[PDB]
From TrEMBL:
Alphabetic keyword roster: Signal
Protein name: Lipase
Species, as recorded: Bacillus pumilus
GO molecular function, one term: lipase activity
GO biological process assignments: lipid catabolic process
Lineage: Bacteria, Bacillati, Bacillota, Bacilli, Bacillales
Signal among keywords: yes
Stretches assigned to coiled coil: none
Keyword Protein transport: no
Residues binding oxaloacetate, per UniProt: R56, K59, K94
Length: 184
């Protein structure tokens, strides 16, 4: 069974940015009512506002579903907000699979953070495009993650791309990586 999916938009974004990805995941057997897309208030995506809002949102999802973990699909600054939640707040034991799309990940960590539950490390798929003019690829790459480079897809187009959707499915089914508990 799939974990609930918490979808995390970027700066200037909205929950409905995930309309295309939600519809795709339903065609692949996710339940539409188990896809939970947050709406942030802060138009810039600042972690000090978005991090705690995401924490409250995830705690609520776990409480009502009874699931042990959520999965994350995050776009742009949403990737930083997710990593901030894991690193600096209480997200480290609440998340299993993370997929970021053009994530501004290196604002918070250069490395894929395994979290705080020794029973299950957080797995990452960081998808980024060489055509992205808004978030440079070096900011999206995460040491120890599965780092996935595509071409031609613009920053906002990441939300509708068929390649991206295929990688989201892989990641939400456990196809991310995190080698940071291993020795070099």
């Amino acid at each position: 069974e799939h974990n609930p999916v918490v979808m995390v938009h970027g700066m200037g974004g909205a929950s409905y940015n995930f309309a295309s990805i939600k519809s795709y995941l339903v065609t692949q057997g996710w339940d539409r009512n188990q896809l939970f897309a947050i709406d942030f208030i802060d138009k810039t995506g600042n972690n000090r506002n978005n991090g705690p809002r995401l924490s409250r949102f995830v705690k609520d999802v776990l409480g009502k579903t009874g699931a042990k973990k959520v999965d994350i699909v995050a776009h742009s600054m949403g990737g930083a907000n997710t990593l901030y939640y894991i690193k600096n707040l209480d997200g480290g034991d609440k998340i299993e699979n993370v997929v970021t799309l053009g994530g501004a990940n290196g604002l918070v960590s250069l490395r894929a953070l395994p979290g705080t539950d020794p029973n299950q490390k957080i797995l990452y798929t960081s998808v980024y495009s060489s055509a992205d003019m808004i978030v440079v690829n070096s900011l999206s790459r995460l040491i120890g993650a599965r780092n996935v480079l595509i071409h031609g897809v613009g920053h906002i187009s990441l939300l509708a791309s068929s390649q991206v959707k295929g990688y989201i499915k892989e990641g939400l089914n456990g196809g991310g990586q995190n080698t940071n508990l291993e020795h070099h």
